[PDB]
Design a protein around this ligand. Structure first.
Ligand SMILES: OCc1ccc(CN[C@H]2[C@H](O)[C@@H](N3CCOCC3)[C@@H]3OC[C@H]2O3)o1
Length: 330
C-alpha cells in the first residue's frame, strides 16, 4: 500500500504545516501537524474543555461507529515552549492520503494549553518519531507509521515541505520526480527515540565549508533551525545589524537586510537553505526588526533540524530494520 497527502503552511511565515487526516466512521477530517519529533497522535475533541477550544475542528468519538475507548489509558504531553495537552485514548480507523490503519490509538484531548487554543489552524498532532516516545499510560501505543509499516510497499515515508507553498507527505514509496540529483543516506540513532543523525558541517553564504560533526534531529514539528551557539554566531555575523536579543528571545535582524544562505552537510552532499527561508518577519506588527530562523540550541540540549532546514530538501525517513535518513536537493 501507499499514501500521499498534501501538507500546507498554516500562515504566511511557514510557522507550521498541516495535513488532512481522516478519523473514524464516517470519516471526521482533522488538520494535523505531522511531527517527526514526537510519537503521539492527539486531537482536539468533543471532550476538550469548552473554553479551550477556539476555532479548531474536533473529533467526536461518540459519532464514530469504529471508535472504542481504550480502558484505563491516559496521555499527557509537555512541549519545550511550555505548552501542553492531555486526555484519554480511543482506538479508531485513521487514514492519510488513501493509506488506512485500523485500531490506531487516537489520543483525545481533555485539556490543551493556551498556545494550542490560540492557534485555530491546528487540530492536533500526528507523531512520526519512534514509538518508544509514546506517552500513553499504562500501556504505550504505536505511531501511525509503525502501524502501517508492514503493509507499505516500502517501509518509508518522505517529507517534502514547501517554502511559502504546499508540499507533500508520502508513505510507502519514493517519488523520484520530486527531487534533483541523488538522495544521500546517512546513519540514524534511535537511542533517544528521534530521527537523530550527524551533519558533516556547514557554510554561511558563499563562505568556506566548515567540516564539523553536528548531531541533531530531523524534526518536522519544529519551525526553526537550532544549531550550536558557535555556528549560529558565525551565521548572524554575516548580517549587518543582526543581534541576539534577550527580550525577544533570540537573534533578530533589520527587516531591510539581505540574508545569506546556509548550507548543511549530509555526508559529502550539501543542502542549501536560501536566505529568505531564514526570515520570520517583524517581531511585532509594524516593527522593522525581524526574527531569525536560525537560533542557538544551547538552552535545548540538542540540535534541531526543523522546517527551516527540512523544507530545503526532499527528506526520506527510512524505517527499515536499521533506520536511516535520506536528503536530496530539490
Ligand atoms: O507548532 C505547533 C506545535 C506544538 C507542538 C509541536 C511539536 N514541536 C514542538 C517542539 O518540540 C518544541 N521545541 C522546539 C525547539 O526548542 C525547544 C522546544 C517547541 O514547542 C512546541 C513545538 O516547538 O508543534
Amino acid at each position: 500500500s501507499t499514501g500521499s497527502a498534501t501538507t500546507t503552511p498554516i500562515d504566511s511565515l511557514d510557522d507550521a504545516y498541516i495535513t488532512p487526516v481522516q478519523i473514524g466512521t464516517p470519516a471526521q477530517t482533522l488538520n494535523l501537524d505531522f511531527d517527526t519529533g514526537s510519537s503521539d497522535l492527539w486531537v482536539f475533541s468533543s471532550e476538550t474543555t469548552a473554553s479551550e477550544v477556539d476555532g479548531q475542528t474536533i473529533y467526536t468519538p461518540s459519532k464514530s461507529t469504529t471508535a472504542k475507548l481504550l480502558s484505563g489509558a491516559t496521555w499527557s504531553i509537555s512541549y519545550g515552549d511550555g505548552s501542553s495537552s492531555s486526555g484519554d485514548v480511543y482506538t479508531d480507523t485513521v487514514s492519510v492520503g488513501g493509506l488506512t490503519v485500523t485500531g490506531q490509538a487516537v489520543e483525545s484531548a481533555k485539556k490543551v494549553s493556551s498556545s494550542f487554543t490560540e492557534d485555530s489552524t491546528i487540530d492536533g498532532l500526528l507523531g512520526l518519531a519512534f514509538s518508544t516516545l509514546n506517552t500513553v499510560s499504562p500501556t504505550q501505543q504505536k505511531t501511525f507509521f509503525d502501524n502501517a509499516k508492514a503493509s507499505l510497499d516500502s517501509p518509508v515515508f518522505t517529507a517534502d515541505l514547501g517554502y511559502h507553498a504546499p508540499g507533500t507527505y508520502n508513505f510507502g514509496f519514493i517519488d523520484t520526480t520530486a527531487y534533483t540529483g541523488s538522495i544521500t543516506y546517512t546513519a540514524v540513532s534511535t537511542k533517544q527515540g528521534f530521527w537523530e543523525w550527524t551533519s558533516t558541517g556547514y557554510a554561511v553564504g558563499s563562505g568556506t565549508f566548515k567540516s564539523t560533526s553536528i548531531d541533531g534531529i530531523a524534526d518536522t514539528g519544529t519551525t526553526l533551525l537550532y544549531l550550536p551557539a558557535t555556528v549560529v554566531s558565525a551565521y548572524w555575523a554575516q548580517v549587518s545589524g543582526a543581534k541576539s536579543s534577550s527580550s525577544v528571545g533570540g537573534y533578530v535582524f533589520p527587516c531591510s537586510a539581505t540574508l545569506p544562505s546556509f548550507t548543511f552537510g549530509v555526508g559529502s552532499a550539501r543542502i542549501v537553505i536560501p536566505g529568505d527561508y531564514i526570515d520570520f518577519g517583524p517581531i511585532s506588527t509594524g516593527s522593522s526588526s525581524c526574527f531569525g530562523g536560525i537560533q542557538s540550541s544551547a538552552g535545548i540540549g540538542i540540535n534541531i533540524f526543523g522546517d527551516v532546514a527540512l523544507k530545503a530538501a526532499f527528506v526520506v525517513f527510512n524505517g527499515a530494520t536499521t533506520p536511516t535518513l535520506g536528503f536530496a536537493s530539490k
